[PDB]
């Protein structure tokens with residue numbers, strides 16, 4: 001049966017092998033939508049080269065590359081299975097991987113979907129909380145694909161641009177948080193502090209009205225209500241890059257400060273991620289949970305596991321897509337409003353791409 | 360009768376008359392728990408003297424002083440009338456105004472609470488969203504009072520240190536927002552952008568792990584979930600003072616930014632206050648809505664009205680107190696954990712003068 005409905009899963013993607021680090025970093029640092037940089041065209045290549053070495057080593061420490069693709073596939077296939085059931089009308093569903101900086105690119109995926117004669121195309125961001133640096137960059141990519149070529153899509157487009165508090169996403173974290181707590185020494189459980197560690201963002205993005213911080217906070221809030229405040233929690237931000245100011249307490253300094261102030265049982269939560277990768281397997285698990293945990297004298301530092309293959313997460317993907325169709329909305333109401341202090345001409349256009357759509 | 364259970368309402372307070380402005384600012388800029396200033400004891404006076412004229416003028420423009428006490432008084436009586444009924448066992452209830460920088464200072468209030476020979480003393484913060492700079496400072500005052508008076512309290516203390524998503528608090532905002540929308544043209548209603556304007560915080564306080572940011576967001580989410588995303592929204596921050604970096608997008612820049620980008624139908628919302636005062640009557644109402652929107656060339660820019668005398672608000676107060684008394688809680692789980700990068704010796708001590716309470 002010809003693929004009828006296509007769900008394009010968008011995420012950043014990551015180096016599969018150490019040989020893919022450099023090219024990945026070059027594209028990444030060249031992307032002005034992720035973050036603005038002085039003379040990006042020239043600085044990026046410079047940054048990519050100097051950085052490739054240590055990043056390659058990091059990828060070696062965790063296998064030789066990022067698992068993001070494998071996790072994304074497993075998730076989509078499960079999704080399709082359920083879609084091909086919940087919504088029998090939308091005939092066969094086919095998932096498509098659209099990584100921002102690694103072939104399977106967004107452009108290769110669009111080309112591919114068009115080549116399948118799909119009548120429906122759904123841009124489904126894998127970033128639950130919206131940032132103009134992530135979903136906004138993946139979306140502009142979709143828009144640009146058509147703009148540059150100068151042709152209109154042969155399919156109907158719609159987009160699930162965000163899903164901060166999907167009740168099934170929330171249940172996954174809460175659940176994962178309960179089996180972790182269950183493995184801390186019983187007499188130390190109620191002392192464990194829960195650190196939600198969301199990727200951080202330059203203050204240049206946050207200060208321009210970016211939606212991200214608020215929604216991550218929303219995700220954080222739902223989870224804790226679901227766990228009915230069983231433990232103290234704090235929202236911290238990780239993975240800062242470069243000299244410029246970035247948001248809220250860094251996770252590293254937070255784990256350190258807690259440790260030095262009496263709180264030595266910490267539970268980390270990948271609140272803004274959907275699978276394992278360098279950010280968890282190496283940064284949180286090795287850098288903080290091993291090295292930093294050791295230097296400060298942590299009694300127990302554990303990490304709630306990543307959604308990854310959790311069927312309940314697949315359940316959630318499909319449910320979101322299903323509700324999406326049923327609703328016939330072209331995008332979320334929030335998307336129809338660009339950042340208060342936006343200065344990216346593409347944004348306003350990418351917005352039309354989905355709002356000014358038919359069917 | 361004679362009070363049995365005392366509800367000490369905590370808020371910053373405000374200059375009742377133009378004559379009270381100078382010393383109000385001196386106290387405020389000296390309070391290191393609010394925000395830290397270089398050579399504080401020297402700078403505070405300078406700042407206060409230089410800032411007074413401008414601020415007296417602002418009060419003049421809105422009545423010659425602040426409403427905060429009147430408002431707080433009415434909310435308290437309403438809370439009392441309900442508490443004396445919802446929870447008769449807690450017998451007579453008396454509310455005391457505990458203003459951080461002006462008369463019924465936290466100390467004076469504690470003083471007459473003790474004198475009224477109460478049995479139960481409850482610290483009820485009028486800051487729905489917890490920040491060390493606000494509730495944190497007010498709580499620190501309660502602690503420093505006894506510790507300075509050199510005597511043990513003659514009544515059981517407990518605290519309601521935060522209530523960011525209390526069901527009824529959300530119903531007042533959601534409601535006020537709806538009737539404000541009704542004053543907008545009908546074929547624009549859904550085009551109106553809702554700007555939840557909270558008081559901003561210095562990054563110095565945010566980067567230390569302050570609960571406020573994430574907490575304020577949690578309120579926004581609830582409000583919008585209740586309004587089932589009828590309109591586009593953005594959480595921005597107002598009231599920065601001084602040269603140092605402060606949090607997120609400024610309400611002003613956000614307003615002017617929306618105009619220049621076309622969105623000229625705006626609804627402001629005091630998501631962190633519980634009554635009107637200089638932050639709304641003057642800043643939002645005259646400085647942005649009038650003066651700023653003037654130039655900007657805006658359609659309609661209105662503001663939901665402050666909670667003030669809303670009966671539902673008194674219910675919220677009463678429902679929180681009563682619910683607090685039943686839970687037999689001494690404070691929130693969140694208060695039992697100080698900031699990850701906390702460097703204030705008082706904090707730790709304040710957490711004791713609440714968690715080490717009888718009954």
Ligand SMILES: C=CC1=C(C)c2cc3[nH]c(cc4nc(cc5[nH]c(cc1n2)c(C)c5C=C)C(C)=C4CCC(=O)O)c(CCC(=O)O)c3C
Pocket residue numbers: 012013014015025028034035051055066067068127131133134198199200201202205241272273277278279
């Ligand atoms: C504008 C601010 C951001 C910058 C500058 C940024 C930078 C990076 N993000 C990377 C990888 C990544 N970033 C990722 C999700 C996010 N990244 C985010 C925001 C940013 N991410 C946000 C927000 C994300 C979602 C919550 C993912 C998923 C990877 C890939 C991990 C992998 O597969 O190994 C890498 C490669 C790592 C390294 O240390 O060299 C950089 C440099």
Ligand SMILES: C=CC1=C(C)c2cc3[nH]c(cc4nc(cc5[nH]c(cc1n2)c(C)c5C=C)C(C)=C4CCC(=O)O)c(CCC(=O)O)c3C
Pocket residue numbers: 370371372373374387393394410414424425426427486490492493558559560561600631632636637638
């Ligand atoms: C370090 C961060 C903060 C600073 C430096 C701060 C400064 C002030 N807050 C004031 C008044 C006030 N601030 C107030 C609630 C808050 N203020 C807050 C955070 C701060 N508030 C937060 C957070 C609040 C609650 C969400 C209130 C209620 C007033 C009283 C206004 C009145 O009654 O007229 C005034 C006097 C007004 C003026 O503009 O000169 C200053 C200088």
Ligand SMILES: C=CC1=C(C)c2cc3[nH]c(cc4nc(cc5[nH]c(cc1n2)c(C)c5C=C)C(C)=C4CCC(=O)O)c(CCC(=O)O)c3C
Pocket residue numbers: 396397406409410600601602603
């Ligand atoms: C954060 C640490 C601060 C530093 C390093 C600081 C530095 C300065 N503040 C100045 C002036 C001033 N600072 C002032 C209010 C504040 N200043 C503040 C915080 C600081 N202010 C805060 C907080 C204020 C409250 C709003 C005022 C009112 C002036 C007067 C400027 C003038 O017109 O001369 C000047 C000198 C201006 C000149 O041209 O003579 C300096 C160098």
Ligand SMILES: C[C@H](CCC(=O)O)[C@H]1CC[C@H]2[C@@H]3[C@H](O)C[C@@H]4C[C@H](O)CC[C@]4(C)[C@H]3C[C@H](O)[C@]12C
Pocket residue numbers: 599600601602
């Ligand atoms: C922020 C404050 C205005 C008071 C207010 O908020 O109304 C203004 C008044 C004087 C200003 C300062 C003075 O112009 C002196 C300095 C000039 C430098 O170019 C920036 C820092 C510098 C140290 C300024 C920081 C800040 O813009 C100040 C302190």
Ligand code: FES
Pocket residue numbers: 132136210337338339342343344347348
């Ligand atoms: S940067 Fe957010 S809409 Fe343009």
Ligand code: FES
Pocket residue numbers: 491495567696697698701702703706707
């Ligand atoms: S500053 Fe927050 S607990 Fe000390």
